[model samples]
Target: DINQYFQSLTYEPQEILTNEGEYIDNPPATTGMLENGRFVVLRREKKNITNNSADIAVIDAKAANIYPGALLRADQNLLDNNPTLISIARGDLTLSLNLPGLANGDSHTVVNSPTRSTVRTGVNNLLSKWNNTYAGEYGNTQAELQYDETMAYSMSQLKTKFGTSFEKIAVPLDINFDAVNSGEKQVQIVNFKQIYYTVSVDEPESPSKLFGTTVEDLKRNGITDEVPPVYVSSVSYGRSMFIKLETSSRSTQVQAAFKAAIKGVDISGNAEYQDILKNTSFSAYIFGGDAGSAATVVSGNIETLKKIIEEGARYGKLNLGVPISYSTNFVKDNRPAQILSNSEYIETTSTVHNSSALTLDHSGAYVAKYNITWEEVSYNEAGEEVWEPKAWDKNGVNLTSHWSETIQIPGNARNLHVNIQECTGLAWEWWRTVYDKDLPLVGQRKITIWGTTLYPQYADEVIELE
Candidate 1:
């Protein structure tokens, strides 16, 4: 009678269990992107309906050897719904039953075997625990979100013009997941795209002043108009020479270029010229001219004049004046009288402009897709359960095609935390980079022109992010 009662058993599928052991009637539609595959539990419920006297309340139970494990137990019989739900992650499950003995002193045997009709067991026959392993090019690799100089410049300009603090960008994820079982599974994919701030300010211009005058004197002159050069003189004698280059160019570029040209000249063959070059001293003087004019006077000895004539050609042609008669009374004072009239004046207008900017460094992104596949469990000759890949379900259809999401990035964000629920274990990864705003700027250089402080604005700063 007890055997007969056991043979009439029946069971029904119940809710499924998430990898975390949470029970739900339906799996979540979508899971955030993951780095590893997931495991889900398939549960089935069975109720004891036998009224035979020989059959007693089930005292205990245990699942046989099964991969991924399983749990079996009897629900409290006093409860309204007394059916027991068996949860298993994978493989065919069987329970070893124990029952109280008929005698007053209780003792029982471990009944490991049940008739084929006694208890229906197998995770596949119930609701299958669908799992997916993300596939395609985007799954395992990280995509580089390259912020080139041009893009940085554009973003900086945008922030500068609009005063925008944040911007939203879109990354198209065309990745697919190969389903481990057949069925429509909803997947939610999420990621933290990198955010950047483009901060910008007008760079200060190079400090300027009138030739040969202090910056304070230049300020005193208060000239705002662009000044033009009067003339340049290149003169050489038998053993000595004097050269005067007069111009209004005040930028470091011009000054540096002139010095480079003078230093690079080769005059080793002539001993007298070499001596002249060795003892020559070059000086730049800014002479405040008429309120509308700005002039610079650069003077050097004989060798300096020859080198200028040879290498300073790029600065334009120099006036080699006609040979003059030497007089015993002629004094060798190297000062030009033409500059004295205007040397008392200076330009007060600021010539150096300074600007600052913040732009995107480098970030990461990827494309993802959802692929559907089928899988089933099979028992081998050794009675071991094995999951085998199967052909795609002919009836299964994927309604969604692509995933595109736009995430807003904070303007001051320095670290981005990416959370992917689909990935097992630790699901958080961080992306970090140095922000341009966080770095200190090489402030404008200060140069004393004739005992006056002149701020010379340099080129833009270059920031390297790792």
Candidate 2:
């Protein structure tokens, strides 16, 4: 029976990075107040986080039909805990949140801002624009609901305050809950939600000091011409951006709002590559930003940056095109249509921020690994999701989620690879899936929009086969 056949697989998470150019700022993880939480997530093949991280639509890849696709997920909550999505089984008892470690982290700072030359508009302007087209109230209107600029300033301040401390380090992870053992649940992608480290500066490294102040300092002091030692990021809850955003709260909208502030700059959130791994060199660009945009993040990780390097970065760093329209319009008489002009035009033009290129140091994380057998829950007749059979005996917790046989954990997986994306000819189709619109059989059809593409640096959460 195919139904009884447990198709087991092992999944590991790798951080995503793009070549937005600047290093990412490491802001403190948002949590506690408002119970907003952030996470290092490894999601299911179709688990859309666009509402939270805004990435369901933004996919960065070398090309369409490039590699095997991804299928599941995991995430590290603020306290380095797992934040599982609940599968409610009870009655009207509606289990709003059955998953423990419910992320209480705040939204991320606005990392992608529009560059200069970008025109700004907002909800009120939209309302007026809508009204004018319908009711003829076409007067030059004043908009009160524009994007925020102060938050952008605040993000800068936050970036300065936090600065990059945890550079040159890599953290290992346990995608599994560490609740199972001797079973399949052991192998899953674990990502560092946050890493932290401290450097005692006898005197605060100010404007003139390198590794302390503004980008100008780094520029002046000069980057190590030689590939610097592999510095792990001291990631924790800290991050950088325009507004103070907690990952778990409604503040995500704030991240969205702030995005309006920098609506055109080439923004990215990724890492750089060293010639060390396979003598392959690489760089990354904006995979995605804005809390709801979580697609590019996961897609990038699954593709494995090293693969990108092996394929392309070997030639050059993958570049991230400035955010073009992910939310789309159509072909009117053979050209771009009303989606851009019609009321469906949802993205604000002024919204954009730059979190790419901001740098952060990481507290070298304690590493671990294991071989895991994989399993998944499917929608049942009643449309309910269920995790059948697979359970595990990990560290001590008797668990039953998705598991198989213990193959390996941290030791088995390798390559914390990531990549940035370039816009493609099938851009609309790539994002259309986010809207769940007419989903074309991507494999069978021609998604010309997904043509031009870019990728990030390469490195896998290496799995030792030998």
Candidate 3:
């Protein structure tokens, strides 16, 4: 059962291995350079509750897709439809889930900037989306503090426009980590199971609310073309929203969001939600008297309104419907912590040549000290052309290059020359003049080899090579 997904790669809750030894506690993540100029690292994080169940956090840092053909095609499955829409659905569900005062849960995406100044600016630029005419006020009243306030305010605006029941809204979150574009690198954090759902808005109401005068507004000042229609789903208002945590780009951000979404419960402050009641108003008009500020519907309007309240109170049943400050129920679930190696020490072996030979009583016994060298290249974050060597080995082989003493041969042995094929961990080039052709570097990368060596045997012991 353990090997089903993780295979043989497994470890304790807070364990990491290195040349130094097994790090049972917290170990600082180290970085190294690949053959290319880019950098790769084994970053270690403390045991947070989310990752308590699993110690490893594997990120598919690879830029290529797993199934590039079907995945990248123009049309495949649900991806082409763009599933992020449910995240911003303007309806009762989105409202209750996001309003901080009413709901304790905060699904607002958290983003970080390299610099503190642009951090707020970049965040605000994203929050501005909450000002969607129908969803504007959610952000307008926000404290602009962290993501919690962001989602709370934004969802409140949705509630204001869409009422308690409606469906479907899409919130596109862009974390501009590029410096040239926004002047700094950025990273966004949020939940995977966001409020992604399709709504079936009432035809006439949904359009005007979503699009203004022209539910299908045209471009070029209404002269170019008819706007694409926004169709209200035939699905019921109670039919829960369709959720998707993964986006078109399965980048690091999406994965983190997905992890958070499944683990945490969406909750809110009851007192905070009660504050929404101030906007409620009721009227009992009898007869209009004047049109100006001095106008009066009736002489004794106070008694008229008072009478209506008492009468309605007496008539209204105990179960009479009224909006509450918070929802008594919530929707949430938990997902297994994704397993990944923050650090992977793949075991590899290299040949440490022994130029010197051993002599035995005029027999000229040559002793070649064959050891291992576990060297990887790194730029040291200093310069490009000056790539330097760094040590790496996951199998916990602590032998150094200079004194590994891997193999020792006798002078009288048949094979004085140690025959070496492909070493286990190192990359060697080969020319396949045979086959028709190959993708440039199609056979170039991620090399692995199981090697064997033939060395001279002595009476006492036999030396084997890695």
Candidate 4:
């Protein structure tokens, strides 16, 4: 099941299609503007991984929710609570999964940054400086890079094995190609439609951690009352999106939202989770320190979440999860609020989030493209704009008019993203994880930390072959 839009639109791993027949100057991403003021994305050569080009190169990118209604509210049978809480829950899950070294066998603790810079040096630094406050000093530290020669040979033989259409396809990946970091994008990229489970955090030993957080960061950064909470942490965050392939995903993930009945509530459309009804599995990790740190949640943390995944397995829907991060904030309307997104939630910050002089609230973090049209914005009485300036102009033409953008990170590689609409390789990968299985890293190595994904082996074709 592929998105119809992608069939009509195609581009190389590091390259994107443009108004002209040829690929953009930067085929891979949407960066600089063309003579027509249109921007083109450049594809940096390197191995593609983490959910791109999975026989699913074509995907539909949406700026707003298409599924309709607030999932959390729907789960409550349309009780109509603010939908913002859903995104908060989703961000918490992502933070737990990203922690490098902080676990033991299927569940341990480690510190590793997936970025090239961090992979090369950051991981090493964590080990060299292990401590009680921190977890590191990997005793059996080793890189388990995947290399499935069969898949390699298949890729070399033809791109069809990976869903390539021949001319756009080529030979198998060179042994020289590396999944983690390589000159040419890897033939295999990890892609999938990841959703969320409710994240439950034990009351922290100290509530002081909630003092100045992402919510506070927004006020300091200049987002005002006119701004919707989502403006705080720009959810359009990807390590290397400039060279990335269609990176599409959504947040507003909540465990209860995916359920059919909760406390006598009928939650189908409200949660907008009917699409993933088959295997209602969701994932999350626990971060050690503040909302900024990475951590994976225990599988059994939330009774409802654990029950859904466990039961979904008996059924047949695809499982989902995404990379999320969170921050702490004081109780918002009496309920604790988790700050979402790890990037610049605010465009700028004041002396220190200006809580004393300004109203403090969380900006939304569920972003689609780093560059997109303003889904919504706020304006002031003085005709001044408040919150994230809308990406539109009344004159129909403006300088900031850009529908595409590219970041320097993910240099020419497809990033792990959410596109649950299709049953691509990523779908298969996530399904396996629902059973507490591992993903196909192809040619990647990782350490087992607390929670799932603690295997020393990369389970995909490239990893076995290499």
Candidate 5:
């Protein structure tokens, strides 16, 4: 289907050098806000401590089975707090955070403030210690919090903001499919796996001018480093700490599925010339600020930072927004969505702000790779008799009764992907499913939890994929 999920896919490149380092004035109450609104966590894989040996021979020759997952989710009215699971071991993986008040047990190696170190438990002391073990009153003497030596030194300056290395800039995705003049036509190329650039410039004066700009200033005129750049700093949304870099080019070009009219005889792209095309366009430049109501607003658009970098991406979901977790301010005061400056000389003459002359082509976001097939059917006391948790489409606006997020709109029919009869009607349907605590909530609670049902939300609003 979507050419077998983007043929042997070769994505995953994050080299974001946002501006230079040392940040964290408030950084989301010091990295702890998540009643489930923002989360994409997955620290490392095949690693790249700033170009780890250039890509260790293409991530040891196309490494597979990569799953060190993380996405704490949020916006369920800020799930009430509880999200601190710090354990960054790396490689064979260990970067914790599976939600639900930190799931009991040793409650993730209890580190009750020895100065809360996991570098001061940043990310808002790990979402505030995973909401003080799942939204407060978590028994056994609570109180552990931490994270703010300038948000643990701005998370050791974004732990090394990525400097690209999916085996040193992976390549190979080149689907063509042509039959043309009325048959097939797929034509691919969406590369740009990950390249986040957010320069706010100015914010350093005395402290001997805290290393403001340089990768040589973006490289000499110091603008995008011949696009062949890699500096890496990132983290801290509001009040800056950007200066990031993670490389990958060939930005766009999708013109897919040359749609050949209807298919009463269908199976996805049935043929007649299928349909999805995307259009095309790319070029980049931006410098924003809003500490004291906006000032360092240097804007040069060939298309609003390429439509805010494809608005958090759609169907081909992989961009990790780059800087990963340092909180991009879950919408508002959850803080860090890149606003910057509260004063220090516009924040030290704005670091002379930098720009990258992007000239990539094709921005016709043909994002319509569908899914949702529930047959077989079987289940009573409520288990799964074809339970369709999610399916999008339909933008006419009408989903209340405490909405939980999911709106695909912008062009409809991938069959308008719907499903949310008021959030699956429920009954101890708890999360997505499962729970067998010998069937009990509190008979003088001795609590012995296990894990499962954490899909609570999917927040996929990628409107305008044309």
Candidate 6:
């Protein structure tokens, strides 16, 4: 049974070829020879062949150490086909294996013994036979096998292991080589485009306050024509009385009437007078017990008072007196409106007067006095018209009478002019209150009062004189 087992194992003689094409004794094998006719043989048992269904498994299993019989046959086939090596020794033989489905420069080579010379050839032959017999089942197996090995190696390692001539094969089907080699996981990418927008807003209306006094003031200031109706009422106790009066009037009325009265005046010929006329404004006041009372009475009687004011204004003097009487019998008194120069004061006094005629009494200090000046035009050395002070003094002009001056024109004078500087002053009216106290004759007394001062303003005027 042992002999049969020894006979069952395959055996071959190890020999080398010389120049004469005859087998020469292998010098290494002579060491195992015996003295008898029988020689000791070292038998190498065949390795267990792995039953790998995949080409990569088969290639990896057999590529490192191939079958000796298959290696020897491939080597002999190569040697027989190439006649240039007529007497090449087996130990010194060099063989090359070009496997299918490998890169163009990926052929493997080996030298010396046939066992070591056919790794690439064994893999090539096995894969070739599998592809030829089961074409569809083993499609691209050779390429897949080489690719699998290459996947495990770096570029430099592949170069060293597969030789510098090895080129990389195309990726095999069903294997995403890029994904496998990448360090990061593959993912889908979506990009969004950028957009721009233009924004704007509308301006809101200006806000206003809801003060009733301000509304009434606005109406009285002639700012709005839509005036609301006002009511007046009065209440009295033993010695104290409270009166409320409200009315509407335009502030522009006095200025308009003044402008109308001065229509015949020669002001249009001078631009200075035109400017003065445009800028001048007149404020009206009423005469009553107090300043507030005056304002109320003026608001009611503005039309009639403006006419009387216009008559006195034409002569450059404002002088008038209006008597006011109440039901209670008190001492008869009159408060007169006096006209004074811009330098004089229009004073207010609490002293009761029994006189009926308006008198010029400069007893008290002036309030809100304005400065008035006059100038004349003359020609300079360059023949240019120049304004210079004339003979009439600013202080000498009395505003109480008609403001007039007759100046004799010099024979050489080219033109004559008068300048009345702009000025402002307050107009005041006085009143008195009669009341009865605890006693009959002694308690009956009078309290003099005045209204809010009115500002009558004027702008500078230049009149051309002959």
lDDT string, candidate 6, 1-466, tens digits: 2222223323221111111111222211111212132222211111111111101001111122212112111122121211111111222223232223344522233333223234234434443443455432212222111111212212222222222112221111112223322211111111000101000111111101111122223323322112111100000100001111111111223233333323324434543323323433222222211211122212213234334333322221101111111011000111111111111111111111111111111111122221223343343343244566633343323233123323332222222222222122423432111111221111112211112223222222223312
lDDT of 5 by residue, 259-278 (tens): 11110123234333222212
- Cα lDDT of candidate 6 equals 0.21
What ranking of all candidate models by TM-score puts the best one first? 3, 5, 4, 1, 2, 6
- Assess every candidate by TM-score: 0.15, 0.13, 0.18, 0.16, 0.18, 0.11
What lDDT would each prediction earn against the true structure? Answer: 0.20, 0.18, 0.21, 0.21, 0.21, 0.21
Q: Is candidate 1 or 4 superior in lDDT? A: 4
- Candidate 3, residue 417: CA error in Å? 14
Q: What is the C-alpha RMSD of each candidate to the true structure, in Å?
A: 51.3, 34.8, 28.1, 34.0, 31.7, 60.6
Estimate the TM-score for candidate 3: 0.18
Per-residue lDDT tens digits of candidate 2, residues 272-332?
Answer: 2211121211122222122222222222331244343223212211111112111111101
lDDT of 5 at 168: 26
How many residue pairs clash in model 1? 43
Which residue ranges in model 2 land beyond 4 Å of their true spot? Answer: 1-175, 178-309, 315-466
Instruction: Estimate, for each residue in 165-272, the C-alpha lDDT of model 1 and write its tens digit.
Output: 111111111111222111112111111111110001111121121021222332233211121111011111010111222222222233333333343444344333
Candidate 3 per-residue lDDT over residues 1-466, each given as its tens digit: 2112122223331222111112235333333323232223322233211111211111111211211001111111111122111112122111111332323332233222112233234323433433333233312122111111111112222222222111122232222212211211212222111111111112222222322133222232211111111221111101011121212121233333333332322312232332112211112221111110111121122233334323322232211111111110000011121122222121111111122122111011222222122222332332222333322221223212222222222111122222112212323522111111111211111111111212222221222222
Best by TM-score: 3
Q: Tens-digit lDDT track for model 4 on 1-466?
A: 1112212223221221001121113113212212222112222332222212211211112112211111121111111111233332122111112222224321212222222233223323332333223422221121111111111212322232222222221211122223212111222222221211112122222212212233433334322323222211111111100011110111123223332322214454365654333332223222211222232233322244445333322232112112222222222121222211111010100010100010111111111111112222223343243344232122122112112222111111222221101111243443222112222212232221111222212111121221
